[PDB]
Amino acid sequence: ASPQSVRALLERHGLFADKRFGQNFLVSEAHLRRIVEAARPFTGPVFEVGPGLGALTRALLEAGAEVTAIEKDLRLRPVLEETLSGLPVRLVFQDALLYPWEEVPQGSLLVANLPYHIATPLVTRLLKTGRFARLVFLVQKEVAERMTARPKTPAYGVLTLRVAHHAVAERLFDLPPGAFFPPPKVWSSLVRLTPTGALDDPGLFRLVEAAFGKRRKTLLNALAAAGYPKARVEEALRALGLPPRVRAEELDLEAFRRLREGLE
């Protein structure tokens, strides 16, 4: 893969990169290799969402992964068949947001150059399945920052705590716009999530989502606004030794879990 090879491949197939599909294709073989290495060992079947021109798909397959590749853009079928000629892969033409994720084998892996517009809801769904051993994927740098944020930083929020609840999170490296054709407007990052097997905790997330809803308020006032009894919230913060005017972004996962318990 190279900027010239990718441009040439698109042109030969009559393709354009379509923004409606968030198409930005990997253009660096070295980066492809680093993504594959980050996903090893392939202890379970691999799912790739958005195989595109098949560059990562081919590298995964050559590394011995058993791959299902889910692509929404049917126009990519000819180039994918060409790229993957002779190689065992399940190509599925479907919107990945509609794929039956809850039924994948326990121990499955995700390895993907995700389209920006589905990355957050897709990863959130896959985490809620509890079916994955590892998820390795590209997201915009700001989204990687949310997924790996520490408390009291701009990026810290509901997505940080959603990820933390289910999985260990790592931002492994960043990729400049030039690693893709066409180049996006922002940097990307390779994120690795390793699930602990924890499933959704809807009560905890009702609390977390209420906490971050009203961004201008203290935590107490945010939760009171969402219908939590104020006296009960006051007492629970106090019992935890937290300042009365503590803000939502100052609490870590442990603190939210204990706040929840105090309230019930």
Ligand X SMILES: CSC[C@H]1O[C@@H](n2cnc3c(N)ncnc32)[C@H](O)[C@@H]1O
Instruction: Consult the annotation and say whether 50 binds a ligand.
Output: yes
Instruction: Consult the annotation and say whether 200 binds a ligand.
Output: no
Which residue number is nearest to ligand X in terms of Cβ?
50
Give min distance, CB of 256 to ligand X, in A. Answer: 31
Choice between 34 and 232, CB closer to ligand X: 34
**CA 145, CA 91: separation in Å to the nearest integer?**
31
Which window, 68-76, 100-108, 215-223, 253-261, contacts ligand X (CB under 6 A)?
Answer: 68-76
H/E run at residue 262: helix 253-263
Give min distance, CB of 17 to ligand X, in A. Answer: 8
Sheet of strand 132-140, all strands in order from the earlier edge strand to the far edge: 89-93, 67-71, 46-49, 108-113, 132-140, 188-195, 167-175
Q: What is the largest CA-CA distance in the chain?
A: 68
Question: How many helices (H) and strands (E) are present in the chain, helices listed first?
Answer: 11, 9
What residues have CB less than 8 Å from 261, skipping those under 6 apart?
none
- If binding is defined by CB under 6 A, does position 22 make contact with ligand X? yes
Choice between 122 and 219, CB closer to ligand X: 122
What are the backbone angles phi and psi of residue 242, rounded to the nearest 5°?
Answer: -90, 145
Binding to ligand X, residues 104-123 (CB under 6 A) = 113, 115, 118
H/E run at residue 138: strand 132-140
H/E run at residue 69: strand 67-71
Can you tell me which of 27, 48, 73, 247 binds ligand X, judged by CB under 6 A? 73
Choice between 27 and 210, CB closer to ligand X: 27
- If binding is defined by CB under 6 A, does position 32 make contact with ligand X? no
Please check whether residue 2 is in contact with residue 146, taking contact to mean a CB–CB distance below 8 angstroms: no
- If binding is defined by CB under 6 A, does position 72 make contact with ligand X? yes
Binding to ligand X, residues 41-60 (CB under 6 A) = 49-50, 52
H/E run at residue 165: helix 158-166
**CA 47, CA 152: separation in Å to the nearest integer?**
35
Can you tell me which of 37, 62, 95, 235 binds ligand X, judged by CB under 6 A? 95
- If binding is defined by CB under 6 A, does position 187 make contact with ligand X? no
Choice between 23 and 28, CB closer to ligand X: 23
Choice between 160 and 188, CB closer to ligand X: 188
**CA 126, CA 123: separation in Å to the nearest integer?**
5
> What type of residue sits at position 5?
S
Instruction: Consult the annotation and say whether 24 binds a ligand.
Output: yes
Instruction: Consult the annotation and say whether 95 binds a ligand.
Output: yes
Residue list, annotated binding site for S-adenosyl-L-methionine: 24, 26, 50, 71, 95, 113
Question: Which residues of this chain interact with ligand X, rule CB under 6 A?
Answer: 21-25, 49-50, 52, 70-73, 95-97, 113, 115, 118
